[PDB]
Amino acid sequence: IVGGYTCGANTVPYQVSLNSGYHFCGGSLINSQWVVSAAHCYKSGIQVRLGEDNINVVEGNEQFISASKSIVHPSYNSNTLNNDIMLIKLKSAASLNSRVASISLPTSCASAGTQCLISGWGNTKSSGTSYPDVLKCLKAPILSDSSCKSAYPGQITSNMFCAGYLEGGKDSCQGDSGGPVVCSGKLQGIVSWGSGCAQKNKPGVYTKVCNYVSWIKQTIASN
Numbered sequence: 001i002v003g004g005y006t007c008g009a010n011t012v013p014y015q016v017s018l019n020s021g022y023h024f025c026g027g028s029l030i031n032s033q034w035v036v037s038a039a040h041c042y043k044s045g046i047q048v049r050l051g052e053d054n055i056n057v058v059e060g061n062e063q064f065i066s067a068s069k070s071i072v073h074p075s076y077n078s079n080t081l082n083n084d085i086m087l088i089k090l091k092s093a094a095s096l097n098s099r100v101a102s103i104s105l106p107t108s109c110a111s112a113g114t115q116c117l118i119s120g121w122g123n124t125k126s127s128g129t130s131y132p133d134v135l136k137c138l139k140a141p142i143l144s145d146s147s148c149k150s151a152y153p154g155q156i157t158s159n160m161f162c163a164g165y166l167e168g169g170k171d172s173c174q175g176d177s178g179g180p181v182v183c184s185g186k187l188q189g190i191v192s193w194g195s196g197c198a199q200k201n202k203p204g205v206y207t208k209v210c211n212y213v214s215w216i217k218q219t220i221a222s223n
């Protein structure tokens with residue numbers, strides 16, 4: 001997260017860290033046994049870390065649970081980043097509490113100008129590398145489709161939306177991939193891609209979760 005603020009310990013209780021010996025992606029808890037992330041975060045050997053604030057210190061409230069299976073959208077395209085979504089099933093159910101809780105799936109799509117909360121442990125610099133210990137937060141609005149398509153001509157599908165600031169300075173970044181975009185208490189996006197971080201006229205691009213609710217529901221019900 002570039003240009004954000006320190007969320008405060010466990011203030012974003014649905015946020016997870018995907019760990020393979022180091023943090024590499026974010027995700028969102030959607031019930032006690034399933035996490036939603038980005039397809040491009042797929043790898044083998046994922047440990048899901050719940051209840052984290054400082055990802056480098058055991059502070060209490062953490063739960064570490066191995067992934068039992070990861071389900072990449074069957075139509076994910078690694079060239080166009082279309083359908084950049086994945087479900088992760090936990091080997092055992094998380095213990096839900098005030099510090100570890102799920103986020104609701106949307107019943108409808110959010111409109112342009114909706115203000116959302118974006119969070120992650122990714123890089124905090126637009127130039128160069130600086131990874132935080134603790135979770136960072138950013139309030140950002142959903143941009144109109146025309147602005148989004150003007151910024152990334154030819155590259156925006158109906159499964160994507162832009163969020164952020166055209167003037168630059170505030171964006172998600174490397175390491176935030178797969179994390180939540182939460183608007184009015186519902187999960188509307190997944191951190192997917194961008195052109196650098198926090199550059200002018202190059203907002204972040206997010207997977208449009210409201211287009212996948214039926215798919216998520218049906219996939220979880222059969223696994």
Ligand SMILES: CC(C)[C@@H]1[C@@H]2[C@H](C(=O)N1Cc1ccc3c(c1)OCO3)[C@H](c1ccc(C(=N)N)cc1)N1CCC[C@@H]21
Nearest residue numbers: 040079080171172173174192193194195196197198204
């Ligand atoms: C593995 C990919 C997804 C990678 C991913 C994310 C991304 O932007 N990619 C580059 C990419 C690939 C294909 C594309 C593309 C950008 O635009 C059109 O087609 C991702 C990334 C995510 C968000 C931002 C941002 N909000 N500025 C910027 C970058 N980067 C950071 C590390 C992983 C890498």
Ligand SMILES: [Ca+2]
Nearest residue numbers: 054057058059
């Ligand atoms: Ca910790």
